[PDB]
Subunit: 120 residues, 4 copies
C-alpha cells in the first residue's frame, strides 16, 4: 500500500501518480510524455491488497480515458502488471490502448505495449 | 452513460455490472463464469464521457483484482475496448490478466484474450 | 495436416491459403480484406504436427510481411492460435501487427487483435 | 539482411539463430532459456526486405512450434517486432504464446510478453 502509493515514471518519462487504498483501490492521475495528450488524466484501478508472501509481485491494473479539460483522444489505455518491492521497486506492465472506431476500422482499434515504472 | 450503465454478459456467461458516472467513472462488480474465481469482485474504470458523434464507438476500460471475501487469485485483469450503441449494443474488449509472479516466472505472468459483452 | 491445409476466411473476409508440411511447416499466401494491402502476401509459420489426443486444439502460428509486388506497408503481422477440428473446424487466433517506426514512435508500433478463420 | 542474419540473445538468455533471405524469409532455430523447453526448435518467419530509408525500424516476425525431438509442449509462440540497426542493433518484439486447449480452457490459451534481442 505504502509500496505502491506515490509518483512513478516509465521508460518514456510519463508520470503515474497513484494512491493505493486499504480496500484495493488505485486512484490518481497519469501524464503521458508521448502521443496526442497533455497535462494530467484521471486514473482508477485495483491491486491485490493481500498479496502472496512467497516473493511474488503484487498484481494490479488501472485505466486512463484520454479525456481531460485540454484534449479528448476518444481512447482509453489499461495497464495490467505487478508491483515488485525491494531495493529498486518496479511496476512492470503491459497495456492495451483502444481508440473509439467505426465497425469498419474496429480491426485497427487497439495498440499493445509494455511500460516499466520506477520511483526515480 | 445510460448506454453503458447496467448488466452485461460476455461469450463465457460472465456478468459485468457497471455504473457510468457523468465524470467518466466506471464502478461495479464482475463475476467470471470461468477460472479460479467465485461470486462478485469490485471493478473500477474509465470511459470517454464526450465521445465522437461520427458513429465511432466509446473508448473505455476497467480493472478487476481477483480478491474478494471468498478467494484471492493474486491477479488482476484489465479490459480495454469500446461500447457500440444501437439495436444490438456491444462492449468489444481485449484484456490482459497479470498474475503476481517471482522474477523467474515473470515471462509467463500475463494472459491475453478478447471478450464481447452484450445486454442479453 | 489435412485438417489445416486449404483455404480459410476470417470474420473480415480475408483469405488465408496454407499448406501444412508433415515436418510442422506452414506455407502459403494471405489476402487482407482490410487496411493498406492488396493481392496476396507470402506467409510462413509452424504448427504442432503431433498434437495432444485429449480433444485439445493444435497450436500454430504464422507471419506475413506486408511487402509484395504491389505495396510495402513496412509492417508484419503474426497470428498465434489453435486449429479446432470437427463439424465446424476453426482457427482461433490473436495477432500482433508491428509497423517499422522511429524510436520516438516505438510506443505506438504494435496493433493487437483477434481473427477467427473458418472453411466457408 | 546482413543486419538480421546471425545469433541474437534476449533478456532471458534465450538464443535466436536466424538467416534473412533476399526474398523476405526468416529461417533458423530458437532455444528458450525458460519454460518447459530444451535444445533448438525450428523457426520460420518474414521481414520487410525493402524497409523505409527514413530511420524507421524493419518490421519482422516469426513462429516457433514448441515441438522438437526432445519435447512437445503442444504450443506455438509468434514474435512480432522491428529490427533497429546501428551501434547497438536490437530486435524489439512482442510475442503471443498459444497452448492447444479444450474449448473450456480456450479463454486461458494465450500468454503475452515482450522480448528484446541484442547481438551480445
Amino acid at each position: 500500500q505504502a509500496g505502491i502509493t506515490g509518483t512513478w515514471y516509465n521508460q518514456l518519462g510519463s508520470t503515474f501518480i497513484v494512491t493505493a487504498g486499504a480496500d484495493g483501490a488505485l486512484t490518481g492521475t497519469y501524464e503521458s510524455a508521448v502521443g496526442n495528450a497533455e497535462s494530467r488524466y484521471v486514473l482508477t484501478g485495483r491491486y491485490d491488497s493481500a498479496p502472496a508472501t512467497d516473493g511474488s509481485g503484487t498484481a494490479l491494473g488501472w485505466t486512463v480515458a484520454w479525456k481531460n479539460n485540454y484534449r479528448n483522444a476518444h481512447s482509453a489505455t489499461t495497464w495490467s502488471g505487478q508491483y515488485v518491492g525491494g531495493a529498486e521497486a518496479r511496476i512492470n506492465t503491459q497495456w492495451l490502448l483502444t481508440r473509439g472506431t467505426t465497425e469498419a476500422n474496429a480491426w485497427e482499434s487497439t495498440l499493445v505495449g509494455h511500460d516499466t515504472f520506477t520511483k526515480v
